[PDB]
Write an enzyme that holds these catalytic residues in place. Structure first.
Site, PDB file in Angstrom:
ATOM      1  N   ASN A 106      21.642 -14.242   3.863  1.00 34.54           N
ATOM      2  CA  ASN A 106      21.268 -14.218   2.440  1.00 34.54           C
ATOM      3  C   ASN A 106      22.271 -14.937   1.588  1.00 34.54           C
ATOM      4  O   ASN A 106      23.379 -15.153   1.935  1.00 34.54           O
ATOM      5  CB  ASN A 106      21.074 -12.852   1.968  1.00 34.54           C
ATOM      6  CG  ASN A 106      19.993 -12.217   2.722  1.00 34.54           C
ATOM      7  OD1 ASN A 106      20.197 -11.262   3.429  1.00 34.54           O
ATOM      8  ND2 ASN A 106      18.854 -12.850   2.685  1.00 34.54           N
ATOM      9  N   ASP A 126      23.738 -13.967  -1.071  1.00 27.25           N
ATOM     10  CA  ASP A 126      24.866 -13.079  -1.449  1.00 27.25           C
ATOM     11  C   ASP A 126      25.947 -12.947  -0.347  1.00 27.25           C
ATOM     12  O   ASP A 126      26.931 -12.180  -0.541  1.00 27.25           O
ATOM     13  CB  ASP A 126      24.361 -11.731  -2.003  1.00 27.25           C
ATOM     14  CG  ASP A 126      23.758 -10.801  -0.953  1.00 27.25           C
ATOM     15  OD1 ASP A 126      23.846 -11.078   0.308  1.00 27.25           O
ATOM     16  OD2 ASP A 126      23.248  -9.717  -1.300  1.00 27.25           O
ATOM     17  N   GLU A 135       8.824  -9.089   9.044  1.00 24.93           N
ATOM     18  CA  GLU A 135      10.308  -9.186   8.910  1.00 24.93           C
ATOM     19  C   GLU A 135      10.866 -10.012  10.053  1.00 24.93           C
ATOM     20  O   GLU A 135      11.769 -10.821   9.840  1.00 24.93           O
ATOM     21  CB  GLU A 135      10.942  -7.827   8.885  1.00 24.93           C
ATOM     22  CG  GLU A 135      10.683  -7.044   7.619  1.00 24.93           C
ATOM     23  CD  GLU A 135      11.349  -7.583   6.403  1.00 24.93           C
ATOM     24  OE1 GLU A 135      12.156  -8.584   6.555  1.00 24.93           O
ATOM     25  OE2 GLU A 135      11.047  -7.149   5.263  1.00 24.93           O
ATOM     26  N   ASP A 176      20.683 -10.092   7.259  1.00 24.30           N
ATOM     27  CA  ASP A 176      19.679  -9.126   7.746  1.00 24.30           C
ATOM     28  C   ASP A 176      19.524  -9.199   9.241  1.00 24.30           C
ATOM     29  O   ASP A 176      19.406 -10.292   9.798  1.00 24.30           O
ATOM     30  CB  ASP A 176      18.320  -9.431   7.149  1.00 24.30           C
ATOM     31  CG  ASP A 176      18.336  -9.642   5.688  1.00 24.30           C
ATOM     32  OD1 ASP A 176      18.992  -8.889   5.034  1.00 24.30           O
ATOM     33  OD2 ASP A 176      17.680 -10.524   5.188  1.00 24.30           O
ATOM     34  N   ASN A 182      19.991  -4.846   6.209  1.00 31.09           N
ATOM     35  CA  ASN A 182      20.976  -5.649   5.519  1.00 31.09           C
ATOM     36  C   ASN A 182      22.371  -5.102   5.565  1.00 31.09           C
ATOM     37  O   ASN A 182      22.594  -3.898   5.442  1.00 31.09           O
ATOM     38  CB  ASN A 182      20.498  -5.840   4.079  1.00 31.09           C
ATOM     39  CG  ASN A 182      21.296  -6.825   3.330  1.00 31.09           C
ATOM     40  OD1 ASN A 182      21.066  -8.042   3.376  1.00 31.09           O
ATOM     41  ND2 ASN A 182      22.274  -6.325   2.585  1.00 31.09           N
ATOM     42  N   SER A 230      25.398 -11.620   2.655  1.00 30.61           N
ATOM     43  CA  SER A 230      24.984 -10.630   3.581  1.00 30.61           C
ATOM     44  C   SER A 230      23.990 -11.252   4.547  1.00 30.61           C
ATOM     45  O   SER A 230      23.440 -12.313   4.357  1.00 30.61           O
ATOM     46  CB  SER A 230      24.443  -9.352   2.898  1.00 30.61           C
ATOM     47  OG  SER A 230      23.160  -9.553   2.317  1.00 30.61           O
TER      48      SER A 230
END
Ligand code: NA
Length: 129
Positions: free
Chosen positions: A46, A48, A35, A52, A59, A50
């Site tokens: 991201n 969308d 990650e 992380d 998220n 959002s």
């Protein structure tokens, strides 16, 4: 902060992740590596809208507040910044909620595609734990 492998294993163990919801410690170390590369400061946006955050790439659509993810929740009751700390506490505590939520570690895409089913004890080999 960029953790060593063994050093993060030990921190995770002290914060109660080993065998948390039945996930052995190597699971968690393996998910940190893929990650974030063990970097508490990793961020990634991201499609969308959002983002992380931190060592376990948690998220903003569900779990923390960043002020820029409309309509999102904050189920961990924290600022997303508080997940970038050198102290992993907030990240662990929130990860415990996520792994509880029904899908287990499959929440973490890179766990599912790079750690699940593999020899994850390898990630803690050699460590004084
Ligand atoms: Na949010």
């Amino acid at each position: 902060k960029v953790f060593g492998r063994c050093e993060l294993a030990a921190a995770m163990k002290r914060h109660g992740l080993d065998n948390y919801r039945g996930y052995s410690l190597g699971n968690w170390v393996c998910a940190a590596k893929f990650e974030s590369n063990f970097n508490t400061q990793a961020t990634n946006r991201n499609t969308d809208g959002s983002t992380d955050y931190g060592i376990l790439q948690i998220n903003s659509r569900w779990w923390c507040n960043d002020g820029r993810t409309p309509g999102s929740r904050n189920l961990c009751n924290i600022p997303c910044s508080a997940l970038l700390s050198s102290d992993i506490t907030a990240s662990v505590n929130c990860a415990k909620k996520i792994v509880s939520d029904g899908n287990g570690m499959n929440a973490w895409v890179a766990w599912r595609n790079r750690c699940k089913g593999t020899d994850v004890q390898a990630w803690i080999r050699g460590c004084r734990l």
